[PDB]
Amino acid sequence: TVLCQSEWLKYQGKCYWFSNEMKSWSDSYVYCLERKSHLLIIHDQLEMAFIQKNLRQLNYVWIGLNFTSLKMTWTWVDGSPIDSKIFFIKGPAKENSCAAIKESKIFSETCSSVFKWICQYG
Amino acid sequence: TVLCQSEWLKYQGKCYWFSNEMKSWSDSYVYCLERKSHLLIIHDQLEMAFIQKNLRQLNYVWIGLNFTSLKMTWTWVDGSPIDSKIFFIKGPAKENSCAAIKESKIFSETCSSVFKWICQYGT
Ligand SMILES: *[C@@H]1O[C@H](CO)[C@@H](O)[C@H](O)[C@H]1NC(C)=O
Ligand SMILES: *[C@@H]1O[C@H](CO)[C@@H](O)[C@H](O)[C@H]1NC(C)=O
């Protein structure tokens, strides 16, 4: 009894929007921000499961994770750095590296490549 | 009586941040949004004046205006379309056209070019 914006999915008191269009990580992020939400932050394994049920493999999907290179680790859009236990990222940790889900792995891709994305809010 | 974030300028109840770094219009917009603000919306001529006082000319500066091409007009980031009376824009009205101030004129540029920008928020 706390309603999601119409056409969003509700899961554990968060609301999710999975895109059909594709865009740069920045453009995706703008999309979410303008809609009072952010790119998807995965809190735990069970949430990972939920995301995976709503995703085609063979499709890079931007998530709210990127390579800072101030603290020189990957941080979520939260500002919390990634748990190297829970998550492993395949690919280079350069600047202008952003994370995407593909085949149930997280990949480093360049921020300017144009993928589907997921929005999330609480 | 209501204070601006440190190192922002106050003018008529709005706060302005003028960048030193440069980035794409989208990247700039993200920068503003993350800071609970938006790219600069010019309300009137007097505000135009204020902006111009704080800009070195011969420098493109992204502003919060772009070419929709759903309503097929320029709209501010507000969502209000351009007043062809108050403002004139030099340059093509293609998709992926965003507005930038240079030399106190507004130019259409492509969204991917990498300029200084201004953030703004109200009170
Ligand atoms: C990466 O993450 C933050 C959001 O946490 C964003 O401010 C920053 O601009 C991002 N980098 C790129 C290359 O877009
Ligand atoms: C242009 O304007 C809107 C702001 O309301 C924003 O959705 C959009 O991402 C920007 N689009 C372009 C052309 O970059």
Cβ atoms of residues B57 and B104 within 8 Å: yes
Domains of chain B: 9-121 (3.10.100.10)
- Does residue A26 have its Cβ closer than 6 Å to ligand 1? yes
Residue A96 CA, closest ligand 1 atom number:
13
Pairing mode of beta strands A89-90, A105-110: parallel
Query: How many angstroms separate the alpha carbon of residue B99 from the centre of ligand 2?
Result: 11
Nearest residue (by CA) to ligand 1, atom 4, is A77
SS3 A49: helix
Could you tell me the two tokens for A63?
């998530």
- Nearest by Cα to A65 from A78, A54, A46: A78
Cβ atoms of residues B77 and B64 within 8 Å: yes
Q: Is B115 exposed, middle or buried (0-12, 13-18, 19+ CB in 10 A)?
A: buried
Ligand number nearest CA of B28 is 1
Give the C-alpha separation, A98 to B93, whole Å: 31
Give the C-alpha separation, A64 to A120, whole Å: 9
Asked how this structure was determined, the answer is X-ray
Neighbours of B64 (CB within 10 A): 24
Q: Which residue of B has its CA nearest to A96?
A: B27
3-state secondary structure A96-116: CEEEEEECCEEEEEECCCCEE
Q: How far is B101 from chain A (nearest CA, A)?
A: 22
Give the C-alpha separation, B90 to B96, whole Å: 15
Q: Is A66 exposed, middle or buried (0-12, 13-18, 19+ CB in 10 A)?
A: buried
